[PDB]
Amino acid sequence: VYQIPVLSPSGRRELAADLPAEINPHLLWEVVRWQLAKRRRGTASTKTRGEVAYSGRKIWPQKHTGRARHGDIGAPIFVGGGVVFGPKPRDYSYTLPKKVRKKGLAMAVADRAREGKLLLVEAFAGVNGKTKEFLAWAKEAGLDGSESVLLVTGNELVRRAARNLPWVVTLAPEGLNVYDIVRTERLVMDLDAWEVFQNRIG
Amino acid sequence: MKLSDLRPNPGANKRRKRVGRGPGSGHGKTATRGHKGQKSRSGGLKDPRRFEGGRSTTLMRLPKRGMQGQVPGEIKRPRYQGVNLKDLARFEGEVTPELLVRAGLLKKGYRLKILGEGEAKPLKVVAHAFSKSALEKLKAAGGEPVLLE
Amino acid sequence: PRAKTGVVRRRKHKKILKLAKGYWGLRSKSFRKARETLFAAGNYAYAHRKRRKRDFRRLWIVRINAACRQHGLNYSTFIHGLKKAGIEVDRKNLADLAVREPQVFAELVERAKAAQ
Amino acid sequence: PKMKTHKGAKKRVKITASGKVVAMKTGKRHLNWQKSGKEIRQKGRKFVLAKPEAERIKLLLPYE
RNA sequence: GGGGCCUGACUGCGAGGCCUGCAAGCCGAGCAGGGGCGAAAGCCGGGCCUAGUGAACCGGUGGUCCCGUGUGGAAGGGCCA
RNA sequence: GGGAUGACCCCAGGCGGUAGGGGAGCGUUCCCGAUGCCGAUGAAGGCCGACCCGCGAGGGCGGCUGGAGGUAAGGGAAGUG
RNA sequence: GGUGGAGCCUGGGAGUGAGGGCGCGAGCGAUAACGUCCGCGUCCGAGCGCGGGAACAACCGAGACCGCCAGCUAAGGCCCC
RNA sequence: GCUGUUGGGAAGCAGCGCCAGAGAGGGUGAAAGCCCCGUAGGCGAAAGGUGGGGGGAUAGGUGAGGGUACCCGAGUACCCCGUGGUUCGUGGAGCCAUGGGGGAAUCUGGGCGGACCACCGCCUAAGGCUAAGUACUCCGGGUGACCGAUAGCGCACCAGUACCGUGAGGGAAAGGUGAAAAGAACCCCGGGAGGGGAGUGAAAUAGAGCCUGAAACCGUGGGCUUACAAGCAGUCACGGCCCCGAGGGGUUGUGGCGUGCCUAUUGAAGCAUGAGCCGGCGACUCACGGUCGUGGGCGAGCUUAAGCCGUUGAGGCGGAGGCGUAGGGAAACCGAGUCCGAACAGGGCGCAGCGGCCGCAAAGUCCGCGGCCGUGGACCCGAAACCGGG
RNA sequence: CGGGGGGAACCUGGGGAACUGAAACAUCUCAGUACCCAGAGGAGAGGAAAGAGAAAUCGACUCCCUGAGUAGCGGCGAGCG
Ligand SMILES: NC(=[NH2+])NCCC[C@H](N)C(=O)O
Ligand SMILES: [Mg+2]
Ligand SMILES: [Mg+2]
Ligand SMILES: [Mg+2]
Ligand SMILES: [Mg+2]
Ligand SMILES: [Mg+2]
Ligand SMILES: [Mg+2]
Ligand SMILES: [Mg+2]
Ligand SMILES: [Mg+2]
Ligand SMILES: [Mg+2]
Ligand SMILES: [Mg+2]
Ligand SMILES: [Mg+2]
Ligand SMILES: [Mg+2]
Ligand SMILES: [Mg+2]
Ligand SMILES: [Mg+2]
Ligand SMILES: [Mg+2]
Ligand SMILES: [Mg+2]
Ligand SMILES: [Mg+2]
Ligand SMILES: [Mg+2]
Ligand SMILES: [Mg+2]
Ligand SMILES: [Mg+2]
Ligand SMILES: [Mg+2]
Ligand SMILES: [Mg+2]
Ligand SMILES: [Mg+2]
Ligand SMILES: [Mg+2]
Ligand SMILES: [Mg+2]
Ligand SMILES: [Mg+2]
Ligand SMILES: [Mg+2]
Ligand SMILES: [Mg+2]
Ligand SMILES: [Mg+2]
Ligand SMILES: [Mg+2]
Ligand SMILES: [Mg+2]
Ligand SMILES: [Mg+2]
Ligand SMILES: [Mg+2]
Ligand SMILES: [Mg+2]
Ligand SMILES: [Mg+2]
Ligand SMILES: [Mg+2]
Ligand SMILES: [Mg+2]
Ligand SMILES: [Mg+2]
Ligand SMILES: [Mg+2]
Ligand SMILES: [Mg+2]
Ligand SMILES: [Mg+2]
Ligand SMILES: [Mg+2]
Ligand SMILES: [Mg+2]
Ligand SMILES: [Mg+2]
Ligand SMILES: [Mg+2]
Ligand SMILES: [Mg+2]
Ligand SMILES: [Mg+2]
Ligand SMILES: [Mg+2]
Ligand SMILES: [Mg+2]
Ligand SMILES: [Mg+2]
Ligand SMILES: [Mg+2]
Ligand SMILES: [Mg+2]
Ligand SMILES: [Mg+2]
Ligand SMILES: [Mg+2]
Ligand SMILES: [Mg+2]
Ligand SMILES: [Mg+2]
Ligand SMILES: [Mg+2]
Ligand SMILES: [Mg+2]
Ligand SMILES: [Mg+2]
Ligand SMILES: [Mg+2]
Ligand SMILES: [Mg+2]
Ligand SMILES: [Mg+2]
Ligand SMILES: [Mg+2]
Ligand SMILES: [Mg+2]
Ligand SMILES: [Mg+2]
Ligand SMILES: [Mg+2]
Ligand SMILES: [Mg+2]
Ligand SMILES: [Mg+2]
Ligand SMILES: [Mg+2]
Ligand SMILES: [Mg+2]
Ligand SMILES: [Mg+2]
Ligand SMILES: [Mg+2]
Ligand SMILES: [Mg+2]
Ligand SMILES: [Mg+2]
Ligand SMILES: [Mg+2]
Ligand SMILES: [Mg+2]
Ligand SMILES: [Mg+2]
Ligand SMILES: [Mg+2]
Ligand SMILES: [Mg+2]
Ligand SMILES: [Mg+2]
Ligand SMILES: [Mg+2]
Ligand SMILES: [Mg+2]
Ligand SMILES: [Mg+2]
Ligand SMILES: [Mg+2]
């Protein structure tokens, strides 16, 4: 289907996988707006016309005072009083369909695959928890920093080396999500992270 | 693809109807709500599905039929869901209530009763009741009906 | 997220007051009274630009009938001649020949007394 | 909160398979001695309710 | 208007229509069941016609023998009038 | 009708309007875009503008004030006029 | 015949359910009322935008997308304003 | 992490480097990964507290057939009468509880399975105790598509304060100089306040009555204009004067035309309502369910809910269940048919994709978005009144 | 040896309305909610079947989901559940 460039010591061998051929922009969109919605706090609040902290005495009589009609100075028509239809705590989260995400999780990758911005690797040669141990690698992998990257592996040390890097997004392949994919200009994975990936869109 | 690239398809995120914001919107002042009247008022009208303005309602004036139930309530007697033959084409071999549930054909708690609107298949079928038509088709199509207890 | 009036209301009130410059009393200094005034003038204009075309023609006509009567006839009797004569020159121009070029007009008068 | 099925309807009427409202026929509860045999006979049958009124009597049955 | 024999002042339905906001109210050929008047063709689903009426809820009486709260019955119901 | 599709062009016709239905847009607060871009050679805001583009709501440009913040194309959510 | 902001059908959203003057046909009223109650129509309502009517929502004329210091007309008018 | 540079100030632009398990954020004279406080990752308690996890004690725990028929929770069970709870409003009215009356039994006992009787079954009242999973938030902490001084708690400031009330009780307004006070010595007019120079500062119409400083409102100077005129105050044309450099701006003498805005109305300029003016707050939302429409995903199939794991703005798991696949009937019950019926009669409600296996479409279903409906204060403000405790 | 009083709400027990909804209103609802009182605690209550109820089965209690606005309750009205 698609020829994937794999980066091994033996050399850039190529691999193929049956990523989707058509890219549905809307679907990829709806996933995100799910991702970007269920992570909202819902901590906006306003204090209704009964929650305010005033009394309730009719401030002055209904008639013959020569002025308007009023009750308690907690009415939203007053200043410092109640708020009408202001926010409250809310659960913006919501239940997007799985297949819609298992599909947008394959459409996402494939797009970067069409671009060739997708790259896999057997292992990371000589990284062991120091960022600088990575750029020397990333340098030799053509990762110059001119492109934001999504590093997707299980190896902790690796994720720890580059996570501070202004142009690298780290993730355990168990958390690969579209938004982070689209966020980025490239995409890297272990064949491991590649493998579990397969076993999630399947 | 790119975040700026992510539009929704046209029409799938329509705006909203803000009423009470000016002459231009065509919704200002009376807020698309009319002039005076219980309907313009806040809270509004009693359930228009039923109430009619005082007169005896259309539904209250209709007669009641059949048994309405009594306390303690519902009586428990075995319940039967019928599945048609044609809906059984997809399987091979031996059909039972179980598989027909995990397939998405028979609900749990109900018993299995075969119907005939379709065409039998020389299949071992296990159920709690068949139809006169369903049997003839099932025994004719070299099938093996199997009732339960 | 809250979104108070902020900078929006004022600015619009400065739109209405700029168009209201030159108005008497509050009409130029009070917003509300600036709108109530800008409303009328809004209709007075388009009610009057539709009229300019009638305020002039009547004028023009008023000058032609004066000249025409210098030659022994009236605006009525020579509109017909120019008709019968097939002359389509308009009252605006006709009104300017009548003053600056009084001997061209005299011709038209003559070509009108005869066309009848 | 979720809507409550109006029982005043579910005890009188019944929604078909196509979306129609069928309620029994009014008239033969009592005062029937001098009525016809045709009038008693016909009134012992259901009648499809007028479209507008049925539509209302289905919004009261949100779960049937 | 007179008289003879009679009970169609039927049961089970009922195409198509008048009227009509709903719901109602109105006319109704014809098919079967079983009958009546007639030699027969035919008529008869009360009355030459248009008013003489009252929706649902609740309950009464006869019938049906459909449900019966572990089971067989009963209490109490539903359907028909 | 062109042409093929909202590319812009031509021809014809419609366009008073309250309650009210509908459609397309401007603008304010906020989020991704953003470890980015604008900014002391001066942010937001404020006073002028007879200039520019927009049917209009509004958007830029310039000059004075102002003295540290502002935030694009494209989308999302409202205490939105 | 009629290709019209015509009609039929299904479905969503309404507002209206306080109308008024005029004309013709009636009732009621006194062959009164800027009276009242119905019928066909018209207009104002929503055209209190324009011309005429001295001035005036509904009588006469005429259905205002915008601009012109161009032309023709309707009612009504041509001694002066 | 230094330098050089503009600048009042460098964190800005330029050159050359570096750290990064730390490029979260906040400060520093402006915009700093490497200047300060911090961040990732690690360390830490003599003494009080806690200690649901680890180890150790202790109170406490335990057999079987045989016969015996002593015990097995009393004004209690049980019956009736009056009530309360349960979905049950006397209903056919059981079950749980009990104020009144009558009033037993110890396994061959008694309560129960929706009046009652029987069969069959479940349980074992009238003594008590019992962790966690659950609820709230005066307190401390983390975090926000929460507010940003009419907002956000009633209080960002000496606020439940001033002030009101006899008392319960009511309840405010009020933030900001500057990077740093370097907060204006001294001299001058004045009693002082206040100002005028000097001086500080990048800036003093940032001078403490201080950041920005809008609008109403008030005043000084200037240009045009007005004392025979009339008027919703404006609009059109022309002309005169002033300004700016065949055009424009300000102004208004004359001629034409012209019945404010909003509201409620059959109808208002309307002698009908509201509004002195300006600035800010100020009214169609939200959650669940429903019903049409819509963009998508899957499609005789679609979809999970609470939760479990993961993450620390990572998502995945979970099939219980809900809608759908068959309807008709009051129901037994039949079933592509079924109901009224004696009927093989008649009628009601019902029953059946497109190209070349493939693809495409679809019943249906799921999440989004939108209009509308039901339930709640449900578009905002407003009663006269009812009630409860003080 | 113990008690007495205080604690923002949260908890259990003893008592316990009304406006309102039913487009009037009395049964009904609002609701055993608001409120008063006693008590307890970091939680309180409940809790080891004289249970549930038809599986010939389950196995204390508490809480959340679901079962379900189903069963049923109701001047079978509004509504309750
Ligand atoms: N190793 C990982 N899984 N890292 C995920 C990101 C964690 C954190 N939000 C960060 O940016 O540092
Ligand atoms: Mg919010
Ligand atoms: Mg209160
Ligand atoms: Mg309060
Ligand atoms: Mg208070
Ligand atoms: Mg007063
Ligand atoms: Mg009040
Ligand atoms: Mg006050
Ligand atoms: Mg209040
Ligand atoms: Mg407040
Ligand atoms: Mg306050
Ligand atoms: Mg105040
Ligand atoms: Mg408010
Ligand atoms: Mg509100
Ligand atoms: Mg929440
Ligand atoms: Mg929503
Ligand atoms: Mg959720
Ligand atoms: Mg980035
Ligand atoms: Mg990074
Ligand atoms: Mg929206
Ligand atoms: Mg909405
Ligand atoms: Mg409108
Ligand atoms: Mg609209
Ligand atoms: Mg209104
Ligand atoms: Mg409306
Ligand atoms: Mg409406
Ligand atoms: Mg109104
Ligand atoms: Mg009204
Ligand atoms: Mg109305
Ligand atoms: Mg209200
Ligand atoms: Mg009301
Ligand atoms: Mg039932
Ligand atoms: Mg506002
Ligand atoms: Mg403003
Ligand atoms: Mg405004
Ligand atoms: Mg503006
Ligand atoms: Mg204007
Ligand atoms: Mg005009
Ligand atoms: Mg003209
Ligand atoms: Mg003139
Ligand atoms: Mg003459
Ligand atoms: Mg001519
Ligand atoms: Mg000359
Ligand atoms: Mg049914
Ligand atoms: Mg009946
Ligand atoms: Mg009956
Ligand atoms: Mg009769
Ligand atoms: Mg009869
Ligand atoms: Mg019958
Ligand atoms: Mg259901
Ligand atoms: Mg169904
Ligand atoms: Mg006779
Ligand atoms: Mg006779
Ligand atoms: Mg005989
Ligand atoms: Mg018929
Ligand atoms: Mg009818
Ligand atoms: Mg009758
Ligand atoms: Mg016969
Ligand atoms: Mg015969
Ligand atoms: Mg015979
Ligand atoms: Mg007959
Ligand atoms: Mg008769
Ligand atoms: Mg006779
Ligand atoms: Mg009657
Ligand atoms: Mg009743
Ligand atoms: Mg039968
Ligand atoms: Mg029984
Ligand atoms: Mg039986
Ligand atoms: Mg027996
Ligand atoms: Mg017997
Ligand atoms: Mg019986
Ligand atoms: Mg009976
Ligand atoms: Mg009957
Ligand atoms: Mg129009
Ligand atoms: Mg037109
Ligand atoms: Mg029109
Ligand atoms: Mg309208
Ligand atoms: Mg449209
Ligand atoms: Mg729209
Ligand atoms: Mg917008
Ligand atoms: Mg705005
Ligand atoms: Mg950022
Ligand atoms: Mg920023
Ligand atoms: Mg500087
Ligand atoms: Mg400057």
Ligand SMILES: [Mg+2]
């Ligand atoms: Mg802002």
Ligand SMILES: [Mg+2]
């Ligand atoms: Mg801006």
Ligand SMILES: [Mg+2]
């Ligand atoms: Mg500026």
Ligand SMILES: [Mg+2]
């Ligand atoms: Mg800053």
Ligand SMILES: [Mg+2]
């Ligand atoms: Mg932005």
Ligand SMILES: [Mg+2]
């Ligand atoms: Mg944009």
Ligand SMILES: [Mg+2]
């Ligand atoms: Mg986005």
Ligand SMILES: [Mg+2]
């Ligand atoms: Mg608001």
Ligand SMILES: [Mg+2]
């Ligand atoms: Mg608002």
Ligand SMILES: [Mg+2]
């Ligand atoms: Mg058409």
Ligand SMILES: [Mg+2]
């Ligand atoms: Mg039309």
Ligand SMILES: [Mg+2]
């Ligand atoms: Mg029409």
Ligand SMILES: [Mg+2]
């Ligand atoms: Mg319609």
Ligand SMILES: [Mg+2]
């Ligand atoms: Mg009415």
Ligand SMILES: [Mg+2]
């Ligand atoms: Mg009226």
Ligand SMILES: [Mg+2]
């Ligand atoms: Mg009205």
